[PDB]
Symmetry: C6
Subunit: 30 residues, 6 copies
């Protein structure tokens, strides 16, 4: 089923998203 | 074990995302 | 592990995100 | 107990997010 | 509790979001 | 059974979202 693996990957992806969105916010809130 | 850790990290990343998106909305809504 | 707590917090953050994104959409769809 | 409730609320918030983001895309894609 | 159902719906919503965001990215990265 | 499948699909969609948002940030941050 790979549930532990899926969840681990989700955490990795969400961490990446949190950074990309930080960069967007930094230019948009300026 | 990874599951509890991944979920906690997910919780942290998503809270960071909530704050970045709030900054974007604050500028985009004005 | 705090899994029940992590998940509770995730729900709180995602709820906040749903509102911020609603405000963005309201100005962007106009 | 919170877990089933948090997840249901998460499901609801994310569905709301899907609709807001669809509104943004509809304007941003045109 | 509807946990299996909530999670199934989350997957459906997130799939929709992945597409809307693809359309946004396509116009914004251009 | 759906839970393992939904979560895997969620993992895939979120990875796609991480890549789309990275493309947006790359343009919005420049």
């Amino acid at each position: 089923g790979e549930i532990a693996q899926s969840i681990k990957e989700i955490a990795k992806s969400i961490k990446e998203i949190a950074w990309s969105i930080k960069e967007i916010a930094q230019s948009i809130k300026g």
